């Protein structure tokens, strides 16, 4: 049935739907929660670092592709690493080729159709990770979200993985607060800290579990973990 319609990313549902996408879409929420937001000044990432054991380390969900550009993930890390690396090239590439920073905008453009190729092309599969991407640029701080559907969006703020809604609702609730928190990463951050607390469910964010990043005007993409998250904890 679906095993008819789901099995192949090349194959629509009778409703014209790609369950693999929807499946990849599932691994999304399967992924750990992480949060992001932007002011016009700064764009902030807030991540939940999940570990395997305490013996293990804590999986990091945040990536730096660039000074003006770094991202966070939920779902399958391996995909993003490529993509990030792939992306890292681009800002590089641009600033290589053009000495031009990749537009966080133009960035989101890329992976989309890039992802789109994962979709329309039989024998393959979509990526298993949706992305939260903060970037600052000539157009300012930009938080963008990607979907393994290929679909990208700039948001003032957002979160993903598991139950991001709590933050999200609160963030969507919080909306004008942080976007107007300007030159104050901290409350931009602590908004997320509160945000992520909203979608915090199982436990509280910790030194190990909380991961944070910010890019901003004069804030390059900058990741905060541990003691860096400690004060915001």
């Amino acid at each position: 049935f679906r095993n008819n319609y789901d099995g192949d990313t090349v194959t629509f549902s009778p409703t014209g739907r790609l369950f693999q996408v929807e499946y990849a879409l599932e691994a999304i929420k399967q992924g750990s929660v992480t949060v992001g937001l932007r002011s016009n000044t700064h764009a902030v990432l807030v991540a939940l670092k999940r570990n395997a054991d305490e013996l293990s380390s804590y999986q990091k969900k945040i990536i730096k592709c660039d000074e003006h550009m770094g991202l966070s993930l939920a779902g399958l890390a391996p995909d993003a690493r490529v993509l990030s690396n792939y992306l890292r090239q681009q800002c590089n590439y641009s600033s290589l080729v053009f000495n031009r920073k990749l537009a966080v905008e133009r960035a989101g453009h890329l992976l989309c159709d890039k992802a789109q190729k994962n979709t329309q092309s039989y024998g393959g599969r979509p990526y298993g990770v949706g992305l939260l991407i903060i970037g600052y640029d000539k157009s300012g701080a930009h938080l963008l979200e990607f979907q393994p559907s290929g679909n990208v969006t700039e948001l003032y703020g957002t979160a993903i993985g598991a139950r991001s809604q709590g933050a999200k609702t609160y963030l969507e609730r919080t909306l004008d607060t942080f976007i107007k928190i300007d030159g104050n990463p901290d409350e931009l951050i602590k908004a997320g800290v509160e945000a992520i607390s909203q979608s915090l469910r199982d436990e509280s964010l910790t030194v190990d579990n909380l991961s944070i990043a910010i890019v901003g005007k004069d804030t390059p993409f900058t990741i905060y973990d541990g003691e860096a998250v400690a004060k915001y904890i």
Partner: protein
């Protein structure tokens, strides 16, 4: 038998690709979006679905340009169209590279569909989930087409894709009969905004933003540009009054 549905390139006993038909499922599943061949030019209009506060308005812009004279809009997978958009954005410069001229819309057209038609030609080559309203002023006047994942487009004095088309289909067909004369892009601008809201009323349930663009041999001067600002607000207010 069955499974004819499953593989793209397959001719079902009826001689049909149900995937394409299933693609059309995703196609109509697209957000309602319209386009208008007006007098000098064409005009492109699409509802922008606002799903949340966190959405930064006006940023995510569905209509994409090819060259500067070719505006394009599609209902279906946004990645699909963009994928094909660049795919188009290629051919023009490509064409324009060889032919030194920016490509004629019709020239530019058939390119796409063939490419799209490829996406029919193999059971794996999943056609695109998009039908696409596109066109613009070219060497002779405007042109406006809307292309099916089938690889079917045609000349369309107006065109609409997405869910709310039928709300628009009349509305366009109206202005067809309201204005078999023709229409100023700006009135097409005005008319569309209504039509979209009307088209939106199929989708009316949720908040939305409205992307409208256009290619006016008059105003864009044979180029495609976006309906923007006041004339945009005008058409809105125009529409948002006429919606009442």
């Amino acid at each position: 038998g069955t499974g004819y549905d499953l593989s793209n390139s397959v001719f079902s006993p009826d001689g049909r690709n149900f995937q394409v038909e299933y693609a059309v499922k995703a196609v109509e599943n697209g957000t309602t979006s319209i386009g208008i061949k007006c007098n000098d030019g064409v005009v492109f209009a699409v509802e922008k679905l606002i799903t949340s506060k966190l959405l930064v308005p006006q940023k995510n812009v569905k209509i994409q340009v090819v060259d500067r004279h070719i505006g394009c809009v599609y209902s279906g997978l946004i990645p699909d169209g963009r994928h094909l958009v660049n795919r188009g954005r290629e051919e023009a410069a490509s064409f324009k590279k060889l032919y030194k001229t920016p490509i004629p819309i019709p020239a530019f057209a058939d390119r796409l569909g063939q490419y799209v038609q490829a996406h029919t030609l193999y059971n794996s080559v999943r056609p695109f989930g998009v039908s696409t309203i596109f066109g613009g002023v070219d060497k002779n006047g405007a042109h406006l087409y809307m292309l099916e994942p089938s690889g079917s487009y045609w000349g369309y004095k107006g065109a609409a894709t997405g869910k709310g088309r039928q709300s628009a289909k009349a509305e366009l067909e109206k202005l067809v009969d309201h204005h078999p004369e023709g229409l100023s892009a700006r009135e097409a601008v005005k008319q569309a905004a209504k039509i979209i809201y009307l088209a939106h009323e199929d989708n009316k349930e949720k908040d939305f933003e409205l992307e409208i663009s256009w290619c006016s041999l008059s105003e864009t001067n044979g180029l495609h540009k976006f309906v923007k600002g006041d004339l945009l607000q005008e058409a809105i207010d125009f529409a948002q009054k006429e919606i009442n």
